[PDB]
Ligand binder design. Structure first.
Ligand code: CA
Length: 50
């Protein structure tokens, strides 16, 4: 099934490749991007604070 899973409303693309990743997966712990971009500032995960 997986409805609206792959490349959801806010699908992010991993640099150096064409791999999408739903915002839900963005910085979730599972390095989907070859260089864990989604789990880094490369994806836009600046907000942290403690
Ligand atoms: Ca991720």
């Amino acid at each position: 099934g997986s409805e609206g899973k792959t490349c959801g409303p806010s699908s992010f693309s991993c640099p150096g490749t064409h791999v999408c990743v739903p915002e839900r997966w963005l910085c979730d712990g599972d390095k989907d991007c070859a260089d864990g971009a989604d789990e880094s500032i490369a994806a836009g995960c600046l907000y942290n604070s403690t």
